[PDB]
Scaffold this motif. Structure first.
Motif, mmCIF file in Angstrom:
data_model
loop_
_atom_site.group_PDB
_atom_site.id
_atom_site.type_symbol
_atom_site.label_atom_id
_atom_site.label_comp_id
_atom_site.label_asym_id
_atom_site.label_seq_id
_atom_site.Cartn_x
_atom_site.Cartn_y
_atom_site.Cartn_z
ATOM 1 N N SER C 140 69.415 -70.497 68.036
ATOM 2 C CA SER C 140 68.282 -69.669 67.643
ATOM 3 C C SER C 140 68.806 -68.323 67.155
ATOM 4 N N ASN C 141 68.104 -67.697 66.217
ATOM 5 C CA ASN C 141 68.551 -66.396 65.741
ATOM 6 C C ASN C 141 68.036 -65.235 66.592
ATOM 7 N N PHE C 144 70.768 -63.131 67.915
ATOM 8 C CA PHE C 144 71.298 -62.042 67.113
ATOM 9 C C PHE C 144 70.346 -60.840 67.126
ATOM 10 N N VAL C 181 73.609 -74.056 64.883
ATOM 11 C CA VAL C 181 72.725 -73.504 63.875
ATOM 12 C C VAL C 181 71.729 -72.580 64.567
ATOM 13 N N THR C 182 71.506 -71.411 63.979
ATOM 14 C CA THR C 182 70.492 -70.513 64.476
ATOM 15 C C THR C 182 69.352 -70.471 63.493
ATOM 16 N N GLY C 184 65.718 -69.194 62.357
ATOM 17 C CA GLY C 184 64.700 -68.204 62.615
ATOM 18 C C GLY C 184 63.385 -68.899 62.953
ATOM 19 N N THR C 237 78.708 -70.826 63.524
ATOM 20 C CA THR C 237 77.259 -70.868 63.654
ATOM 21 C C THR C 237 76.630 -70.585 62.309
ATOM 22 N N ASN C 239 73.444 -69.590 60.313
ATOM 23 C CA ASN C 239 72.180 -68.916 60.544
ATOM 24 C C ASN C 239 71.237 -69.179 59.377
ATOM 25 N N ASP C 241 67.484 -68.455 58.278
ATOM 26 C CA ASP C 241 66.250 -67.726 58.588
ATOM 27 C C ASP C 241 65.714 -66.884 57.439
ATOM 28 N N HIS C 247 74.416 -62.814 59.327
ATOM 29 C CA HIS C 247 75.520 -63.249 60.156
ATOM 30 C C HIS C 247 76.705 -63.656 59.282
ATOM 31 N N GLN D 236 74.058 -64.860 54.452
ATOM 32 C CA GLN D 236 74.943 -65.408 55.474
ATOM 33 C C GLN D 236 76.366 -65.593 54.958
#
Ligand SMILES: NC(=O)c1ccc[n+]([C@@H]2O[C@H](COP(=O)([O-])OP(=O)(O)OC[C@H]3O[C@@H](n4cnc5c(N)ncnc54)[C@H](O)[C@@H]3O)[C@@H](O)[C@H]2O)c1
Ligand SMILES: NC(=O)c1ccc[n+]([C@@H]2O[C@H](COP(=O)([O-])OP(=O)(O)OC[C@H]3O[C@@H](n4cnc5c(N)ncnc54)[C@H](O)[C@@H]3O)[C@@H](O)[C@H]2O)c1
Ligand SMILES: NC(=O)c1ccc[n+]([C@@H]2O[C@H](COP(=O)([O-])OP(=O)(O)OC[C@H]3O[C@@H](n4cnc5c(N)ncnc54)[C@H](O)[C@@H]3O)[C@@H](O)[C@H]2O)c1
Ligand SMILES: NC(=O)c1ccc[n+]([C@@H]2O[C@H](COP(=O)([O-])OP(=O)(O)OC[C@H]3O[C@@H](n4cnc5c(N)ncnc54)[C@H](O)[C@@H]3O)[C@@H](O)[C@H]2O)c1
Lengths: 247, 247, 247, 247
Positions: C140-141, C144, C181-182, C184, C237, C239, C241, C247, D236
Motif C-alpha cells: 500500500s502507498n 509512504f 506493489v504499493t 494508492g 516495490t 508504486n 497511484d 518513489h 516512479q
C-alpha cells in the motif's frame, strides 16, 4: 555549550533567509563563521548583525574564480574550513511552459554545479589542512514530492542529493562526512517575496504539525549535523518539513 | 547544557547496549530517565551506573499488563513522560529455513507489537498530561538493505517505520512528534554475543567511514531527536551507519 | 501472448476487488490460477466468472492449517506453484483512539503474519518443485504517506515491504524473485463499502493524473511482475497511484 | 501481440548497449522506432540491424539545434512521438581527485541538461499532436548506492530522477506519464570497454540473484513502462539490478 568553538564554518547564500539563520546558529555554537553571498552588502550586513564570530566574504558560487578567492582568504584568516554549508541557491517560480533551456541552465549552474564548485574547493581545503570536516548541503523536499512550477530546481536539488551520496563514500577515508537536508516550505525572505508564499495554507494542511516553517527550524538541524553527535552519519538526507513527506 | 532538565524520558531495553547508551546520554542531557528492561537486574544495575537521574522499572514490552504497571508507576513519580525511546527488541540470527511460524511470532510480538503496546500507553500518558512529547523508535538499516539471516526481524523493523510514519500524522495535532532511527551494525553487548559480531569487517568495507559502530553513535543522535533542535521533524527516519546505506 | 501459459499462479483474497482483478489478468496471460479467499463462495464464484483457467480453493491466510491444505491440494492438481500473489488483507478504517491491542493484533496477524505463513509454504513449494518462482506482495502507498485512520494497517504494510526486501536476498539463490506493489486508492469493492470511498476527491487532487484508481490498474502491473520482462527485478516495490507519492 | 503497433518511439544513445537493446525490443513490440545517437554510423547500423520498424536519425542530445532537427524530421515522417526513452549518456570512470569543473560540466551537460533538451522538445511534440505519451528516462542505481569513481555522473542521474518526479506532475494533465529506471551494472559495450567491467564479480556478490546484468534485462522493463499495463504509473523509478539495492 559552544561545542563548535575553535571550528570554522562557511555558509553560502548566508545574507538572509535560511543561510543567515544557519550562520547565526553556528556562531551561537561557538564557531567562527564565514558569511558568504553573492550580495556583498547583505552578506556583510548579516555578519555585522551576527556580530563578532561572523566574517563576511562575498562570492558567486557558480563562478570558479570568486570561489577560489573565497577560500584563499579563508585559508589566510583561519588556516582552513571545518564545516561547509551549501545554502546558496536560486528559488524560482516557473510554469513548466516557461522553462527555457536558458532558465534550465541558470538554475542548474547555480543550484547544482555551483555547489560542486564550492564543495570541490572546500573539501580540498579541509583535506589539505588535515581537518576532519563536515559537508552539509541544503536540498529541498520538492525532490520527494515532485512539486510543480519549479522543474529545473527539483532536478538540481535531485542532483545535490546524488552528489551528496557519492561524496560521502568519496570522502569517508579522509574522515569527512557529507550530508543533505531537505527543508519543506520555509518562511524565509526569499519565500515571503515569492509566489510561493501563497502556498503556506495548503502545505500546512499536508503537514502533520501545523505551523509555518521557519528558517530557525532548518538552522537548528544543520547545527546538529555540524556537531559530533552526527559523526556516524554520512550520505544521509535529513528531511525537515513538519511531516509533509515521510523519508 | 542540560537542555533536557525537567523532562522525563523512558527507554526500553535499556539495561545494556544501545538502550543503556541512550539512557546514559539523556541523563547527561539533564533528563530524569526511566531505565526499563525485561531484565530487572540489568535495568537497575544500569540505572545505578547512570546516577540519581536514572530510575529502573522492569517491564516486558510485549506484555500489556507489565506495560500498564510501568506507566502507572512513572505517572506517580514524575506526573508523566516527555520522551519515549522504543529500544527493546530481540536481535536474532536465523537462517531462512529456520524461520518458524513460532520464531516469526516471537520476533513480531516483541520488536513490533511490543513497541505498539508501549507507544499506545506512552503517548496516551503524554496526551493526558498535556505534554508535547517526542517518540523515537529504534529500527534498523537492515530494512533498507534486506539483510539476510533475520527475515522476521527485518519485517518487524519495517513495521516500526510504517508505524512511525502513520503515528507522526496521527499525533501531530497533540504536538507530539514520532520519529525513527535506523542503526547499522553496532558493537553492542548484544551483537558481541551474536554471530553478528563476525560481520564487522565486511560491513566496515561497505561503510564510507571505517570504524566499528558504537552504541554512543546512536545515543548521540537520539539525544538530538529528543531535543528542541528536532522540533520540526516528524515522520522521518534517521539512518546512522557510517554510510552503509544512503537514505 | 499467453506468456504465462504452463505456469500456475495463486492469488489470495481473490474473491473480489484487486485480488479478483489480478486472478482475471493472470488467467488472461494464460496461467492457470488458484483463486483463494477466506470467503469460499466468493472465491468460487470468482473462478466460475474467470473461466476454466481458474480454480477456487478457500483458505484463511492467517491460519497455518488451512494454508497447508491450500498448498497440498495445489501440489496435487498442478505439481506446484510458479507465481505467488499475496493479496489477502483487511482494509480497516479506525481512528487512532480506537486502535486496540485487539485491533492491532488482528490486522497484524492477517495482513502481515498471514502473508508470511503463505509465503513460507508457497516458496517452499516452488523450491521443492525446482521452480524459478515469482513472489509478489500487495502492500500500500499509505506506507509512504503515513495515511491516518489506519495505523495498524500502515505498520503491517511496512512489515510486508520489510519482509519482501529480506526475502529477495533470501531466495535469490533459488532463482526466486520477491517484489511488492504499493497501490494508492483503488475503487475496489471494499473501498466502495468503506469510509475510504469518501476520499477519492481529495486523493484525486493530490494525484498527477486525475481518474479514480481501478483494480485493473494494479492487476496489469502484477501481470508484468509475474512475467519474464521482470526477471532482473527483485527486492523492489512498484508504486502505482497516478503520482500520489513519488518513489 | 505487437501492442505498440501504430506507436512511434524515440530512443537516444541507441546505437549500442542498452539503448540499442531497448530500440530492438520496442520494435519487437510493434512500434516504429527512431534510433537516435551521436554516433550517426552506429545509429544507422543499429537500425539496419533492428529492421524496417527502425529508422536512424543522428543527434547530440546536448545540442539544442540538432535536437530541434531530430524532432522536426520525426514529425515529418510520423506526425510525432508517442514514447520517449532518454537513454543517451556518458558513463565515466573518474577518481574523485580527477573530477574537474570541466569534467563535471560535460557530464552534467549531456547526462542531465541534454535529457531536458530532448524531453522539452519531445513532450512538446506529443502535446502538440494531442498524444497521451510516455516518458521514460534511464537513470542508474548508483544514485541509491553512492557509487564511487563517478560523482558527476551520480549527481546528474540524481538530477534525472528529480526531473522525472517534477515532470510527472507537470504533465499529468496532458495524460503524459514520466518515469525513470535505475539499472545496476549491465554488461553493455560501453561497460565492457570501461574499467567498470572489472566490477562484475563484486556487484554479483552484492546481488540477490547472481548473473551478470544484461541490456535485455533493462529493455524488457522499458517495454513494460511503454505499454498500457503501466498507465497508472507516473513519477516512479523502477530499480532493475537483481537486488543490489532495495527501492
Ligand atoms: N526557503 C524555502 O521555503 C525553501 C524550501 C526548501 C529548500 N530551500 C533551500 O534553502 C536554501 C535557502 O533558501 P531561502 O529561501 O532562505 O533563499 P533566499 O532566497 O531567502 O536567499 C538565498 C540567498 O542565496 C544567495 N545566492 C543566490 N545565488 C547565489 C550564487 N550565485 N552565489 C552565492 N549566493 C547566491 C542570494 O543572494 C540569497 O541571499 C536554498 O538552498 C533553497 O534551495 C528553500
Ligand atoms: N546492534 C545493532 O547493530 C542493531 C542495529 C540496528 C538496530 N538495533 C536495535 O537496537 C535495539 C537494541 O539494540 P542492542 O543491540 O543494544 O540489543 P541488545 O541485545 O544488546 O539489548 C536489548 C535489550 O532489550 C531487552 N529486551 C528484550 N526483550 C524485551 C522485552 N520484551 N521487554 C523489555 N526489554 C526487552 C533485553 O533484555 C536487552 O537488555 C533493538 O531494537 C535492535 O533492534 C540494533
Ligand atoms: N483498494 C485500495 O484503496 C488499496 C490501497 C492500497 C492497498 N490495497 C491492497 O490491495 C489488496 C486488496 O484490496 P481490496 O480493496 O481489493 O480488498 P477487498 O476488501 O475488496 O477484498 C479482499 C479479499 O481478501 C479477503 N480476506 C480478508 N481476510 C482474509 C484472510 N485472513 N484470509 C484470506 N482472505 C482474506 C476478503 O474476504 C476479500 O475477499 C489488499 O492487500 C490491500 O491491502 C488496496
Ligand atoms: N550499462 C550500465 O551498467 C548502466 C547502468 C545504469 C545506467 N546506465 C545508463 O544506460 C544508458 C546506456 O548505457 P550503456 O551501458 O548502453 O552505455 P554505452 O556507452 O554503451 O552507450 C551510450 C550511448 O550514448 C550515446 N551518447 C553519448 N553522448 C551522446 C549525445 N550527447 N547525444 C546522443 N547520444 C549520445 C553514445 O554514443 C552511446 O551509444 C546510459 O544512460 C547510462 O547512463 C548504464
Amino acid at each position: 555549550t559552544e561545542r563548535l568553538a575553535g571550528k570554522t564554518a562557511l555558509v553560502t547564500g548566508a545574507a538572509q533567509g535560511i543561510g543567515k539563520a544557519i550562520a547565526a546558529r553556528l556562531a551561537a555554537d561557538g564557531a567562527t563563521v564565514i558569511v558568504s553571498d553573492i550580495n556583498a552588502e547583505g552578506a556583510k550586513a548579516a555578519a555585522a548583525s551576527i556580530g563578532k564570530k561572523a566574517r563576511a566574504i562575498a562570492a558567486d558560487i557558480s563562478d570558479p574564480g570568486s570561489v577560489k578567492a573565497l577560500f584563499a582568504e579563508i585559508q589566510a584568516l583561519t588556516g582552513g574550513i571545518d564545516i561547509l554549508v551549501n545554502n546558496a541557491s536560486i528559488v524560482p517560480f516557473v510554469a513548466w511552459d516557461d522553462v527555457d533551456l536558458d532558465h534550465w541552465r541558470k538554475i542548474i549552474d547555480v543550484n547544482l554545479t555551483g555547489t560542486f564548485i564550492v564543495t570541490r574547493a572546500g573539501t580540498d581545503q579541509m583535506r589539505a589542512a588535515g581537518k576532519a570536516g563536515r559537508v552539509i548541503s541544503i536540498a529541498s523536499n520538492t525532490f520527494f514530492a515532485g512539486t510543480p512550477n519549479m522543474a529545473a530546481y527539483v532536478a538540481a536539488k535531485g542532483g545535490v542529493i546524488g552528489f551528496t551520496r557519492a561524496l560521502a563514500t568519496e570522502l569517508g577515508k579522509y574522515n569527512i562526512t557529507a550530508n543533505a537536508v531537505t527543508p519543506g516550505l520555509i518562511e524565509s525572505d526569499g519565500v515571503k517575496a515569492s509566489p510561493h508564499n501563497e502556498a503556506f495554507g495548503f502545505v500546512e494542511m499536508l503537514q502533520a504539525m501545523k505551523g509555518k516553517g521557519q528558517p530557525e527550524h532548518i538552522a537548528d538541524v544543520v547545527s546538529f549535523l555540524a556537531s559530533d553527535d552526527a559523526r556516524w552519519i554520512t550520505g544521509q538526507t535529513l528531511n525537515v518539513d513538519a511531516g509533509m513527506v515521510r523519508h
